C-alpha cells in the first residue's frame, strides 16, 4: 500500500477563492503559528536543575 | 537642568536595552519548553552585566591594513543616531518638542545606513562587502514604504508634530482607523531594524548591537505611539507614560515572539515581497487615505 | 541651543563609550601576534532614489489639505500617486524586479 | 557536519558547485579488516551517528 | 462579460494583493466626486479663519455688513455646530 | 551675537568643499560632501527653514549620496537682515510649500512627466545589450 | 595591605563576569556533537547557565572539539583556533578528540586534537553524556574561578 | 515558570519609566509649577515674550493677574 | 549682499573649478557636480526665505529633485562606461578626439 502527501486539488468556487485570499491578505496560518508558540510559553518547561538534579539511568 | 533631562534619558534607555538581552534570552527559551539565565544573579538578573564585564575585558582585532578611521566612526554614528531618534517622543511631554518630529525621525532613520555602508567598507573583504551592500539594499527599500505609509497615517493628524498623535487618539485608537497601514508598518520595522525573519546579516561589536537593540526599542515605543494611543491627563502624565510604556513592551515582545515563530525569507522573497506586495497595497491605501477626509470632511484642524 | 546640545551630548557620550571600548583592552601586554559589479543592485539603489524623490514630492501633503481648492489638490495628489504606480509598473513589466 | 564546498556564481545564481568531502574519512573500512566481526560491529553504530 | 468575469475570477486568485491595491485605488479616485459631503469640507476650510478679518469703511451703503459681530448680518456657522 | 554662527557655519560649508574639491579617494569626497551637506542644512534650519533643511536631510544625505556611497562602494553682518513682524497661527514655508498641489499645478504635472522619463530612461541606459 | 586587596577583589570581579558568560564555539565533527546539541536541547538548556548557544568564531570565548580530526581538518582547526580572541579556552570531548580514540591506529586520524591546540578539559566517553559535558562545562568555569591574574601582575 | 520571567520585564519597565515621568517633573520644576509652554507659529511665542517682558522677574510663567491691573 | 551669500558662492565655485580639473576618477566629477547642486540649493533657500517669497518656497524643492535625477542619469552613464574598461577613470574617455 502506499499514500499520497501532496495530491489535493484546490477547489475553485467563489467561496474557496475568497477563503484563500483572506488567508493571503489577513495571515491567518502565521496568527495560527503565533498561537501555537504562545500555548508552548505557559506550560512547565522540560530543564532540570542540574547538579541539585540527575538525568535518569539504569543499571 | 537641561543637561540633568538628557542624561535622564540616555541612561535608562540603555540601561533597558542591557535587560532586553535577558529578557529576550527567557522568553525565547520558555517558548523553546526550556528557560532562559537563571543562574547568574537571583533570576538571571546580574546576567546582562556579566555579559558587559565579559565583552569590555576581551581582546579587540583590528584588521591592521583596514581604514581605522571609518573602523571607528561607524559605532559612533550608529550609537549615537539610536540615541538620538528618541529625544521628539512624547511619554506624554517630549525632550524637544519638534514641530516637524516625524520628518526629523524620518530623517535619522535614513542616515542610518551609513553606519553599515562604512563597516562593510572597512571589512576589507569582498564577502562582508557583499553582506553590506544586500543588507543596505533591504534597509533603503523598506525606509521607502516606511515614508509613504507614515505620511498615509499622518494624514488624519493634520501635522507631522508627535505631540499631536496623543489628541488625535483621544477616544479611539487608529489601528481601528486604519490597520493594513498598521500591519505593512510592523512589517516593515522588523525589516528595517534587521529582525527575523529578516535577518541575513568585543567593544565596538557590543557598541553596534546596544545601538540596534535601542532601535528595536525605539521602533516599537515609536508604533505604540502612532497606532496605539494612551489617554493622557495634563494633571497626572504618569498614567500616561505607564500606558505608553506596557504598550511598547508589548510590542517589543511581539518582536521577539515573532523571532521565535517563523523561519527566515530569502534575500530575493524579501525584495519581492515589499516591491511587488507592500509597495502597491501602499500606494492604493495613500490613495485613499487622501481621499478619504475630503470625501467624509473629516480633515484634521491644524495648517 | 537645546538640540545642538543634545547632539553634543549623544555624540560625546557614544565617542567616549568606543574609545574607553577599544582602549580598556590595548594597556595590558598580550601576545599582540572582486570584480563582479552585479547590475541588479545599482538598480535597486537607483529605483530607491527615485521613489523617494517623488516621495519628496508627496510630503506636503498633510498641509496641502487645507486650501479651499480641495478639487485641484485631490486631483495633483492622486496624479503623483497615479505617477508613482505608473513607475513601478514599468519597471515591473519589463523585468526591472527580478533576481 | 563537517562540509567543504566549493562554487561559483553568476551572482545569486549558483552556477556550479563542487562539494569537497573526506573531513571525517577515519579508514573505517581499513580499520575492520584487523578486527574480528565482534570487534568490528561497534564501528556501524559511528557510521551514522 | 463571461471573459471579463473569468479574468477577475483568475486575478482574485493567485494575484489578490493587486485586485484589493486596484479596487482600493479606484475607489479613492472615483468617490470623493459622488459623495455628499466634500463640499462641507470645502466650507469648513473657507470658515477658517487664519487672518485678520479687516473691516469696511461705512458709507451708508452696505446693508449686508454687520456693524457689530453679534449682529445677524454675515456669515453663520449654524450648520457646522450641528455637523 | 554667538561670535556669528552662521559665519562659522558658512565658513567651515566652504572648508568642507575645500576638502572634497581635492578630489581624493572619492570615498574621501563622499564623506567630505556629507559633511558639507550637513553643515549646509545646518545653515538653513538655523535661518528659520524647518521643512527645507530637514527635505535636505532626508533627501539628499539619507538617498542620493547614500545611493552615491553605495555605487563606490561597488566600484573599486548676519542677524541684521531679518524682518520684524511675525507669520501668524502657521509657518510661512508650510504654507509657501503646500500651496504645490493648488498653485503649482503646471510644475507638478512637468516633475512627474520628468520622474517617470527619468525611470525609462535609467532602465533604457542600463539595459545594455 | 590595600594595593593587594583592590587586586584580588577586581580580579575575583573580572574572573566571575568570564565564567558567568562563556560564549562557545563548536566544531561538529562527528557523533559527539549530536550529544552537544542534546545539552542544548530543553532537558539539560545550556543557556541558563550563561552559555549561549553557537557562537560565532570571532566573538567566542571557548572552543568544544566535539569529533574525531582528521589529518585533512587539522588545519582548519588550528585557524579557527588562531582567529579567536584571547581569553579562549578549549574543552576536548570524546575519546576521538582526546586521543584518537576507535580510530587511533588509523592513516588519516590526529592522535588526539592536543597535538594541534592546548586542551583546558577533557571530557571522556564515547560518547560523554550531555550530563557529563554539562560536568566538563561547570568544571571549566570552577578552572576560570581558581585563575588571578590581577594578583600576579601585581606581585610582578 | 512563565513568571520567571516577569522580574526582568519588570526591571527594565522601570528603566522605560525614567525618562518620560522626569521629563514632567522637569518641566513642572522649571516652569513654576505648570506645563512647559508650547511655542509653534510665532504667535505662542509673541504670547510668551510679552509674558517675560510683563512679568517683571524675566520670566514668562511669573502670571499676573487683575491684582496688577489696578 | 551680506558674507553667508559670499561664501555660498565662493563654495560654489571651488566646486566648479574642482569639476572642471579633472585629476581622474568621474565618480569625483559627479560629487563636484552634486555639490554644486547643494550650494545652489543652500543659496536659494536663503534668498526665498529672507524675502518672505512665500510662493517661491516650492522652488527649492523642484530643483531638489530635477537634479537628484540627472545625478541618477549620470550614475548610470558612470557605470556603463566601467562594465566596457573596468574603472571609471577619466583617460579611457579618449576614443573619440578632435
Ligand atoms: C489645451 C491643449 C491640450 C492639447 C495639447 C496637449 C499638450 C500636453 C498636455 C499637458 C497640458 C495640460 C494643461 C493643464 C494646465 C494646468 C493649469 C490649468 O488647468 O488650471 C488649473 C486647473 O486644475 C486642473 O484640475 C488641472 C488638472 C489637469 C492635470 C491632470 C492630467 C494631466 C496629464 C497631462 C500630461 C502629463 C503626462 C501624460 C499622462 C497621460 C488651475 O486650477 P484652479 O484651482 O482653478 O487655479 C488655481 C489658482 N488659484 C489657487 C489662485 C485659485
Ligand atoms: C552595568 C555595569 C557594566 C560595566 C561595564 C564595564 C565597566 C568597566 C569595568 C572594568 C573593571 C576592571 C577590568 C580590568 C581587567 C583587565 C584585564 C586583566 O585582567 O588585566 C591583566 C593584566 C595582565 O598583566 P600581565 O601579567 O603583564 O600579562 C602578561 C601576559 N601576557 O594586568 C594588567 O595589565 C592590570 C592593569 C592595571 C589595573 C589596576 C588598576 C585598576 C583599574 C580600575 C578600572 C579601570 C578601568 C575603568
Ligand atoms: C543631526 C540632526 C541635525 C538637526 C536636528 C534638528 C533639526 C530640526 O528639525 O529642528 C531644528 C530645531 C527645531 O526646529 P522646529 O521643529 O521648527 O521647532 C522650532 C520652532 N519653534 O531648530 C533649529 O533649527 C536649531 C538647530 C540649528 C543649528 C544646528 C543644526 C544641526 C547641524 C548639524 C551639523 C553636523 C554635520 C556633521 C555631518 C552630518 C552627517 C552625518
Ligand atoms: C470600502 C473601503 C475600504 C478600504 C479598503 C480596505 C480593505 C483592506 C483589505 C486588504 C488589506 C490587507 C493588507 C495587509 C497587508 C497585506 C500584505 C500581503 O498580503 O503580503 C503577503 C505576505 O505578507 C507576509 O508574509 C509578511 C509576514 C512576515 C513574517 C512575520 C509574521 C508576523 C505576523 C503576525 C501578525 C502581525 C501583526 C501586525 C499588527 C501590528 C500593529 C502595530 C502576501 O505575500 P505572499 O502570500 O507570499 O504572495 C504574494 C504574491 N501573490
Ligand atoms: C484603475 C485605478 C488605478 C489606480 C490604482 C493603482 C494603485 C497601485 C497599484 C499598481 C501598482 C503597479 C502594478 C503593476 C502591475 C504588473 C502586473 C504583473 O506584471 O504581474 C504579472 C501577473 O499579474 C497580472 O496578471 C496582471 C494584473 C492582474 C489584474 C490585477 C487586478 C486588476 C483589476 C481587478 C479589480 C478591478 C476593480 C475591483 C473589482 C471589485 C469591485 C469594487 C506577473 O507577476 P510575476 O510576479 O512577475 O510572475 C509570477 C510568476 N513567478
Ligand atoms: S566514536 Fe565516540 S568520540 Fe567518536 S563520534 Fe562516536 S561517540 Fe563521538
Wanted: aromatic fraction near 12%; charged fraction near 15%.
Amino acid at each position: 500500500t502506499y499514500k499520497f502527501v501532496n495530491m489535493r486539488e484546490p477547489s475553485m468556487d467563489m467561496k474557496s477563492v475568497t477563503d484563500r485570499a483572506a488567508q493571503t491578505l489577513l495571515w491567518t496560518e502565521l496568527v495560527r503559528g503565533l498561537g501555537m508558540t504562545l500555548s508552548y510559553l505557559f506550560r512547565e518547561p522540560a530543564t532540570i536543575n542540574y547538579p541539585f538534579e540527575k538525568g535518569p539511568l539504569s543499571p | 537642568m537641561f543637561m540633568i533631562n538628557i542624561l535622564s534619558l540616555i541612561i535608562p534607555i540603555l540601561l533597558a536595552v542591557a535587560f532586553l538581552t535577558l529578557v529576550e534570552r527567557k522568553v525565547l527559551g520558555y517558548m523553546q519548553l526550556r528557560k532562559g539565565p537563571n543562574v547568574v544573579g537571583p533570576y538571571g538578573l546580574l546576567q546582562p552585566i556579566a555579559d558587559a564585564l565579559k565583552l569590555f575585558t576581551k581582546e579587540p582585532l583590528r584588521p591592521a591594513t583596514s581604514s581605522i578611521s571609518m573602523f571607528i566612526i561607524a559605532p559612533i554614528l550608529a550609537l549615537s543616531l539610536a540615541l538620538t531618534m528618541w529625544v521628539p517622543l512624547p511619554m506624554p511631554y517630549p525632550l524637544i518638542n519638534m514641530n516637524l518630529g516625524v520628518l526629523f525621525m524620518l530623517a535619522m532613520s535614513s542616515l542610518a545606513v551609513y553606519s553599515i555602508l562604512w563597516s562593510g567598507w572597512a571589512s576589507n573583504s569582498k564577502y562582508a562587502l557583499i553582506g553590506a551592500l544586500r543588507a543596505v539594499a533591504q534597509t533603503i527599500s523598506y525606509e521607502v514604504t516606511l515614508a509613504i505609509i507614515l505620511l498615509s497615517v499622518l494624514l488624519m493628524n493634520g501635522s507631522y508634530t508627535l505631540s499631536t498623535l496623543i489628541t488625535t487618539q483621544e477616544h479611539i485608537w487608529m489601528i481601528f482607523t486604519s490597520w493594513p497601514l498598521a500591519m505593512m508598518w510592523f512589517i516593515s520595522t522588523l525589516a528595517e531594524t534587521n529582525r527575523a525573519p529578516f535577518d541575513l546579516t568585543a567593544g565596538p561589536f557590543a557598541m553596534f548591537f546596544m545601538a540596534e537593540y535601542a532601535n528595536i526599542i525605539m521602533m516599537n515605543a515609536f508604533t505604540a505611539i502612532l497606532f496605539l494611543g494612551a489617554s493622557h491627563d495634563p494633571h497626572t502624565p504618569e498614567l500616561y507614560t505607564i500606558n505608553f510604556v506596557l504598550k511598547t513592551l508589548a510590542l517589543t515582545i511581539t518582536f521577539l515572539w515573532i523571532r521565535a515563530s517563523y523561519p527566515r525569507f530569502r534575500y530575493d522573497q524579501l525584495m519581492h515581497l515589499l516591491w511587488k506586495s507592500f509597495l502597491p497595497l501602499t500606494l492604493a491605501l495613500c490613495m485613499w487615505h487622501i481621499s478619504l477626509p475630503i470625501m467624509t470632511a473629516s480633515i484634521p484642524p491644524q495648517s | 541651543m537645546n538640540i545642538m546640545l543634545t547632539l553634543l551630548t549623544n555624540v560625546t557620550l557614544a565617542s567616549l563609550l568606543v574609545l574607553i571600548a577599544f582602549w580598556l583592552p590595548q594597556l595590558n601586554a598580550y601576545s599582540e601576534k572582486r570584480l563582479p559589479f552585479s547590475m541588479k543592485f545599482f538598480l535597486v539603489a537607483i529605483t530607491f532614489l527615485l521613489f523617494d524623490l517623488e516621495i519628496a514630492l508627496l510630503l506636503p501633503l498633510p498641509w496641502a489639505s487645507q486650501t479651499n481648492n480641495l478639487k485641484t489638490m485631490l486631483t495633483m495628489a492622486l496624479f503623483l500617486l497615479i505617477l508613482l504606480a505608473a513607475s513601478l509598473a514599468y519597471e515591473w513589466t519589463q523585468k526591472g524586479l527580478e533576481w | 557536519g563537517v562540509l567543504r564546498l566549493v562554487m561559483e556564481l553568476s551572482g545569486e545564481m549558483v552556477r556550479k558547485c563542487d562539494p569537497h568531502i573526506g573531513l571525517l574519512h577515519r579508514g573505517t573500512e581499513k580499520l575492520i579488516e584487523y578486527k574480528t566481526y565482534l570487534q568490528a560491529l561497534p564501528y556501524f553504530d559511528r557510521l551514522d551517528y | 462579460a463571461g471573459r471579463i468575469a473569468s479574468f477577475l475570477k483568475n486575478a482574485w486568485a493567485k494575484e489578490p494583493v493587486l485586485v484589493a491595491s486596484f479596487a482600493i485605488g479606484g475607489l479613492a479616485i472615483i468617490l470623493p466626486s459622488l459623495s455628499p459631503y466634500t463640499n462641507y469640507a470645502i466650507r469648513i476650510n473657507r470658515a477658517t479663519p487664519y487672518n485678520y478679518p479687516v473691516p469696511l469703511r461705512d458709507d451708508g451703503n452696505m446693508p449686508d455688513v454687520p456693524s457689530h459681530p453679534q449682529d445677524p448680518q454675515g456669515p453663520s456657522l449654524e450648520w457646522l455646530k450641528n455637523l | 551675537m554667538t561670535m556669528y554662527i552662521a559665519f562659522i557655519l558658512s565658513t567651515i560649508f566652504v572648508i568642507g568643499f575645500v576638502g572634497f574639491s581635492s578630489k581624493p579617494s572619492p570615498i574621501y569626497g563622499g564623506l567630505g560632501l556629507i559633511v558639507s551637506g550637513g553643515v549646509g542644512c545646518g545653515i538653513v534650519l538655523n535661518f528659520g527653514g524647518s521643512f527645507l533643511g530637514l527635505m535636505v536631510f532626508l533627501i539628499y544625505l539619507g538617498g542620493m549620496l547614500v545611493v552615491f556611497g553605495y555605487t563606490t562602494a561597488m566600484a573599486t553682518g548676519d542677524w541684521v537682515i531679518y524682518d520684524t513682524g511675525d507669520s501668524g497661527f502657521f509657518s510661512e514655508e508650510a504654507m509657501g510649500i503646500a500651496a504645490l498641489y493648488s498653485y503649482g499645478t503646471w510644475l507638478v504635472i512637468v516633475t512627474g512627466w520628468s520622474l517617470l522619463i527619468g525611470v525609462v530612461v535609467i532602465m533604457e541606459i542600463t539595459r545594455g545589450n | 595591605s590595600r594595593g593587594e586587596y583592590v587586586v584580588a577583589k577586581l580580579d575575583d570581579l573580572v574572573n566571575w563576569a568570564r565564567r558567568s558568560s562563556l560564549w562557545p564555539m563548536t566544531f561538529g565533527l562527528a557523533c559527539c556533537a549530536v550529544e552537544m546539541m542534546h545539552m542544548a536541547a530543553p532537558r539539560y538548556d545550556m543557556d541558563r547557565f550563561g552559555v549561549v548557544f553557537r557562537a560565532s568564531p570571532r566573538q567566542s570565548d571557548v572552543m568544544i572539539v566535539a569529533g574525531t580530526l582528521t589529518n585533512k581538518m587539522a588545519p582548519a582547526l588550528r585557524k579557527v583556533y588562531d582567529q579567536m580572541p584571547e581569553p579562549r579556552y578549549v574543552v576536548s570531548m570524546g575519546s576521538c578528540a582526546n586521543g584518537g580514540g576507535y580510530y587511533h591506529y588509523s592513516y588519516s586520524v590526529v592522535r588526539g586534537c592536543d597535538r594541534i591546540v592546548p586542551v583546558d578539559i577533557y571530557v571522556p566517553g564515547c560518547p560523554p553524556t550531555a550530563e557529563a559535558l554539562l560536568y566538563g562545562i561547570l568544571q571549566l568555569q570552577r578552572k576560570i574561578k581558581r585563575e588571578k591574574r590581577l594578583r600576579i601582575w601585581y606581585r610582578r | 515558570m512563565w513568571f520567571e520571567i516577569l522580574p526582568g520585564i519588570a526591571v527594565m519597565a522601570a528603566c522605560l519609566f525614567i525618562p518620560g515621568m522626569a521629563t514632567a517633573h522637569i518641566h513642572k520644576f522649571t516652569n513654576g509649577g505648570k506645563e512647559k509652554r508650547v511655542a509653534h507659529f510665532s504667535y505662542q511665542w509673541n504670547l510668551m515674550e510679552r509674558d517675560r517682558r510683563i512679568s517683571g522677574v524675566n520670566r514668562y510663567h511669573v502670571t499676573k493677574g487683575l491684582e496688577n491691573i489696578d | 549682499m551680506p558674507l553667508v551669500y559670499m561664501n555660498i558662492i565662493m563654495a560654489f565655485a571651488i566646486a566648479l573649478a574642482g569639476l572642471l580639473m579633472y585629476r581622474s576618477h568621474l565618480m569625483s566629477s559627479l560629487l563636484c557636480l552634486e555639490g554644486m547642486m547643494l550650494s545652489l540649493f543652500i543659496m536659494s533657500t536663503l534668498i526665498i526665505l529672507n524675502t518672505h517669497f512665500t510662493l517661491a518656497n516650492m522652488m527649492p524643492i523642484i530643483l531638489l529633485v530635477f537634479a537628484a535625477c540627472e545625478a541618477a542619469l549620470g550614475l548610470s552613464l558612470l557605470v556603463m562606461v566601467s562594465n566596457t574598461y573596468g574603472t571609471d577613470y577619466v583617460q579611457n574617455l579618449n576614443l573619440l578626439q578632435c
